[PDB]
Amino acid sequence: SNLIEVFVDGQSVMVEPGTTVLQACEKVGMQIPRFCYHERLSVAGNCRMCLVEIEKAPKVVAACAMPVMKGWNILTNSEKSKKAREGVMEFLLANHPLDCPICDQGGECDLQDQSMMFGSDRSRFLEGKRAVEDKNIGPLVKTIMTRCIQCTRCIRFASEIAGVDDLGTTGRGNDMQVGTYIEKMFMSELSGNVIDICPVGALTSKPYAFTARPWETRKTESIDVMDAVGSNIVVSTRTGEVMRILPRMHEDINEEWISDKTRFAYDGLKRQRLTEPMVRNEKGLLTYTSWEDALSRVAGMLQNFEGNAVAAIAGGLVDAEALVALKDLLNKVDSDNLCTEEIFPTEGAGTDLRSNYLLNTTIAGVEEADVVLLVGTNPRFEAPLFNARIRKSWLHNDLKVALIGSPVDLTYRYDHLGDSPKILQDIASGRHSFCEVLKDAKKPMVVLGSSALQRDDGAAILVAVSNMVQKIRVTTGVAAEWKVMNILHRIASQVAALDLGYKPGVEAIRKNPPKMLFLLGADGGCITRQDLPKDCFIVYQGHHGDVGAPMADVILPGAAYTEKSATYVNTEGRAQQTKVAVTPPGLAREDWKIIRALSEIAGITLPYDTLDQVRNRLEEVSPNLVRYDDIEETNYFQQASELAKLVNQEVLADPLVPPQLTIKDFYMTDSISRASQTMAKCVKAVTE
Amino acid sequence: KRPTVRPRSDVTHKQLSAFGEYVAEILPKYVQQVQVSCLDELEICIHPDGVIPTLTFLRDHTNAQFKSLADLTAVDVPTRQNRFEIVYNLLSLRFNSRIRVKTYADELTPIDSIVSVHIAANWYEREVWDMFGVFFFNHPDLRRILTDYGFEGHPFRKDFPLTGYVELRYDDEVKRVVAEPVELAQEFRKFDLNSPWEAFPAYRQPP
Amino acid sequence: PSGEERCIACKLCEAICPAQAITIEAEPRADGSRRTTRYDIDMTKCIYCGFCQEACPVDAIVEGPNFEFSTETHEELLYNKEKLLNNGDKWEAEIAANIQADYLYR
């Protein structure tokens, strides 16, 4: 292929044309000092810290900007380059405030580290230091703008990755100021990432403000559970305390960003958390009791009952191990009526084929696509990183986004085809204009969010999408490898439950009111005590005591995602396993352990007593639940569409509106979100 | 001149390089690598089998009278196939010079005892066995020296936890100082101080 | 002198203490300042090196001239924030005099 020969410190390296000096240095292994350069963002060249010497060149060039030329010897560690770095660091530090003892970036400060390595050891600035004002930018980010290095990283992130375009550089000269000119609240589902962006602890988190230091905190790698995207996470902990949540890089999903919910709802783990088993709802006084008492009573009731009288409702943020173990328990009791709160149509192929309930195109494939058709979604406020990927495509790989939903601000420009369901049939018949855009397209995407499927017409909308997407496949030549049907999920555990074989929806409970209910981490209130008999011995396995637990006979404390190495599968089918970061609070235990102990106290006894054996049973139920960080391919959507064609329903005339019309809606959905206080401040601010 | 930079000389470096070549060519059978550091410290690496020959040569040869054994140490490097790296430091009073001899070993690979050459070794070798677990053949009396009378481990190994596995206390029931598994009120705080940026360009390992 | 506590929970003393005796947990007060909810020194683990008062950026932690504080029980030697602040208040005048005498040498 076409490559150029360049030298770094007299050593040859081949680089594709246009690669920057910084990128060639990275290739050879050297890491040039930088501040204003971010690989995800655009190039700025403002800091001038990456200045380097090209040999036999008179003037030092900026390594982050210069696209290398052939036969260039990049003298990284020349006297010229070192003195350039010295001068740049001097000017950076001249006006800085004396805040290192009182600065959240204390131990991680790149300014500190690069002054240490590539910086002088003495100051010769014998004048006064500039002073900048602070301005409330919202309830989440606190701005100490006196210590800005004016690097414009926050502005570039705001205008590119988020599209908010609220932040800017106002003024000129040393009196420059990076911030909103008016008193505005910087509120984006991706706002928090600015905190990690900015390299001089200027704009930092109000919640976490001043708690711990990097040399203290212990970091364990975990996967988010507050959204179906499964954004990889690092949980910073001290002495069992969860200090903060930080992004972990995963090119396919995270790309070094995380949602504000994901990074600021951790506080919910601290308030109103379960700790002790409880019993005695009949008398009305739900009191604490020993594991012996609670488990024995549950096992006794289970022995009394059986068949279709028992059932369970898994929902929200429950894990695959707990799901499979409860499924095994209820099946050994002879049931199969275990259900999930979320509603996915079961009229046709249902859950038998993963091609029906998955994002086949994959978030990575969202970049490759050319026309994406959004139906029944407000993707900005549900799976925000998916919207981030779409905006990335729109900005770089020019893409056309067409939406069949209420007009919302998806950050990018979208062709609001209509807010009606029969528009899908219009496209399928070819009556609509957007069909011409399809004919143009060589890689189409039709993405359908579970939000609409929750409607009463879920089967009708699913069949409409299926027929329309098959029509797209036949009319527009699409390679068999490329998948054009994909589904967006807003609940973390839905895909895992369906892969296991849980019955989607809760129609079974209402059709046959169970005598005993097993509410597993479900406080959605979909099944209230109004249904079921006058006494139904409802048992709650979960955490945070949301509100759904109260109206249950016995409460068994569980562990949140920060304390258990659960298996969580994201919307694209990939399996990711959390890592224990904090021991479960008080007496709380892991859910698979809980269910196995309950069974053994009962006559039944599950085959497994360890995480390895539970994972083996998981592999048994489905094989893709144990291939971690792997996206197993799906097919036979042809057969799915055949069954969908046979399925007979009709799309209502009700306008299709996404549940989340505003960030106020986004900021509280889960139990942890409801129990978190910072989210309350955010919602209050947005409301006013 | 540069007041804060350590003064440098090359005479000693040249002399040590000459002596390094000298020893290497005298003993090609065991010598495997000779290097003179910028600090000016001749450093010979020999095959484990050549310990007795090399040390006897350095002690007895007229042109090399390294009659005093300063240390007999071990450095643990878990990654390398031979974890333990025995270090011998010697001093020649006649020639005002110091030399270092280095060899490798393994848990299952004993090295010969040099007590015959320098009887100073005996106790250093006992410490090496006690702390790192390396065994020495033909040693007069090899036995634990710095560890407890019933200790089960080689503490200086990098795998060994700092606080160990066993703690002692008195128990009135048995009227003896009993040993129990280690439990700590405030566990050791391992601060992560490594800086993301690289510091010393010379020692940059290739990627 | 107003009454405010000098320590601003920078935690450099904790970071440097050779014996790992200092344990600090701080939170942002109502105003927004750094203040230590708990500041605990285990005086049976401390080696009285002085590296804490060496590295305290605001001269908050200081090793007073007192040397007579033998206790009758092991649990009295685990100093806490209240005990340390009371010691500082008690020895303020002499601590201040020594600091003025010495600061030039430091």
Binding site: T239, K270, R271, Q272 | - | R38
Partner: peptide, 21 residues
């Protein structure tokens, strides 16, 4: 004992237990 106030006890966590309505 249980406490609505989250307590940092030595090296431990005690979250806001919250007496259940």
């Amino acid at each position: 004992e249980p406490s609505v106030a989250p307590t940092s006890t030595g090296k431990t966590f005690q979250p806001g237990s919250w007496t259940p309505e």
